[PDB]
């Protein structure tokens, strides 16, 4: 990857190590959706849209030869950049065991944010449609412990009703997590009977949404395509500091509907 | 080790071999830190300091050449005596399975509290800062039994949006254990849902502290440095009995504050 | 040695090898103290503290534990900068034999002072004493030439009456031995009387002290100590130069006060 030039930074090769290891450790946790989407190898830096398989016409009815022009989606590119010092980076050769990487730290968490939001809400300039968009697929649900028991065994008929099959997963807010483990009028763990509900399935929490949802895990329905995954980079020596930068490009895509269905 | 003067002493082995073994068995039981923290390889007898890794100036601004001094951890060093009786000792030859040892017992107790208490609250001659000082990590808690499962779901989030993770473990007090196991309104062992609230974690009381504290243990975050470790010698004789001693050589280190949470 | 940034600059080899033998012929010549003093191996870049042998009691007299401190020596780090022309650097590829060095030379003399001064009469902020300060190993002397030989023919009765053996040299003051050599009432030559009074020694003549002083080279009674030696690296530009710097790190130590003398 020479487009990164990173061979023209005054740094080691340990300075650049333990760089690459902190922000890895923040990204593996902080990203939510490549939990349950699917991710299409990459293309390259070159890559510039996706097909969709149509037609548009835009020539007369008494025409004797007729055209038009065909679909497709376009990509999307980030950048951002952050600024680090010098002679606290240089202690690392005498011997500390721990430096200061604050700055890092902040931007991790905001790109983190804007890659989520696009896969949870969708994105209006470039023609994207998000996962709460699809609002023919809504049923009621209680506050009691066990009308989140009867909701399921409900939804599972509509799965079952299709051909749609397989492992299943729940995804639910902390905060109504909490408040039903804190209301158990029966006396049972709410974990095994919630996981037995379901044949044999899982619970993910998370702070992004409102209220649940739950998905069918077969495979092939929600798919994320990449360009080139993310990295790091230089860009200038500020005569006390050095400035660097993150950058990535993406595109998102729903193919079956038949497998999402929304509680609440 | 020639420094501890053993060929000197009026005793044959057996009656080394048994005074060894009964120190050994209650050091194991009675240290209670090294169950949590790391610990670094022995060095020698001739160690003395631990470098940090910096430097503080001591010259004006106008100077054309520029000088500082660089920083270190000094040890410490432990010594304490006791006494025994002679002709007691000397039955285990004619055949008595139990002799008596009060004395060294007694001194073994006094030297596990010295030690645990430097980790716990540490040192002020000697430049060491204790669990106990980290002020900005501490979270409120309820007596009822739901409430200790509320705060460490609480807890669980606050160590995952760093890049925190690892098995968890608990540290708590044993009278307030007791409590929680005496006042049990919901019919369940707190047990078995303590252990599985945790990804399967494990639960350690003791007499030292006040309060509950929750760490992880991935590694590489807490270390114990140590020059000799724990050993007997032989001081002088005294017309009735014989003179020994208990000596050591030691330090301590914190490293990341990120894996370290106090209760109430 | 990476920790010198030296593949930054915009240099090529034969401009690096021509700075680096200038400084070496000049630190040859004017560096006094190695001429007679030991030196003690390299040990690193992250060296920080030499080990002395002792305990310091910080406890009281009826305690059951009783504990203290270790001692050390601390090193001492230093660093000067100067700045260089590129257009008159650049005259070597066409062909001159001789460029400009003027101020690399200037710097250089400054450390030599620097460092010449700590052995000579110690620094008070480390705990360092130099050889000025033994002030009860120190005997009379004259003026005309025969008191010289009277004085060192008085000097070797007192090592002798101790183990002292070896070689001996004699350090003197340039202008005081001017003086010896023009004021000749005995007609003779002062060197060879001088060096066969010595069992064939040797004579060092320096601007550095004012009196003289003899001493012993049996060897193993004074040491300096390093942890790194002179070096040069680069710092950045100036958009018509650029910007380097000296750095050393060391400590020193005398053993045996037996083996020196102080004339007048
Ligand atoms: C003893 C000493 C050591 C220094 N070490 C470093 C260093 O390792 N890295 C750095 O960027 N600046 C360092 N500086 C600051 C840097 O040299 C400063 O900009 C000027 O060059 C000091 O004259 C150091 C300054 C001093 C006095
Ligand atoms: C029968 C007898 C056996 C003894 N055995 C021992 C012994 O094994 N070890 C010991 O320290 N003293 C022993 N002593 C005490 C010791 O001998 C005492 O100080 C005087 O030497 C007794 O005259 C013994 C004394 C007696 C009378
Ligand atoms: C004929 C000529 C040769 C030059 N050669 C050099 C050179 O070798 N190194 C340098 O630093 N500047 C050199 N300069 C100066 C440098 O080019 C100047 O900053 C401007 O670029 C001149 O337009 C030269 C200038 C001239 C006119």
Redesign the interface.
Same mark, same amino acid.
């Given at each position: 990857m020479e487009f990164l030039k990173r061979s023209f930074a *005054?740094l080691?090769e340990k300075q650049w190590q333990e760089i690459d290891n902190?922000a890895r450790?923040?990204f593996? &946790?902080?990203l939510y959706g490549r939990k349950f989407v699917d991710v299409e190898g990459p293309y390259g830096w070159e890559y510039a849209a996706h097909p969709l398989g149509e037609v548009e016409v835009l020539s007369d009815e008494n025409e004797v030869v007729k055209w038009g022009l065909r679909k497709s989606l376009p990509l999307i590119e980030l950048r951002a950049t952050f600024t680090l010092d010098l002679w606290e980076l240089?202690?690392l050769?005498?011997?500390? *065991?721990?430096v200061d990487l604050s700055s890092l730290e902040e931007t991790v968490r905001k790109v983190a944010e804007f890659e989520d939001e696009v896969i949870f809400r969708g994105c209006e300039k470039s023609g994207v449609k998000g996962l709460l968009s699809f609002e023919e697929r809504k049923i009621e649900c209680g506050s009691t412990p066990k009308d989140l028991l009867e909701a399921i065994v409900r939804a599972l008929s509509i799965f079952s009703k299709d051909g749609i099959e397989g492992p299943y997963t729940l995804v639910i807010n &902390?905060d109504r997590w909490?408040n039903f483990?804190?209301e158990?009028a029966e006396?049972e763990?709410l974990?095994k009977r919630v996981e037995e509900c379901l044949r044999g399935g899982k619970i993910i929490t998370t702070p992004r949404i409102e209220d649940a949802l739950v998905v069918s895990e077969r495979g092939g329905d929600f798919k994320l395509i990449l360009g080139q995954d993310l990295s790091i980079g230089y860009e200038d020596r500020e005569?006390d500091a050095v400035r660097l930068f993150i950058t990535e490009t993406f595109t998102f895509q729903v193919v079956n509907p038949e497998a999402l269905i929304l509680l609440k």
């Open positions: *005054p080691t902190r450790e923040i593996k &946790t902080q240089d202690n050769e005498r011997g500390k *065991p721990n &902390t909490i483990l804190k158990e006396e763990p974990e005569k």
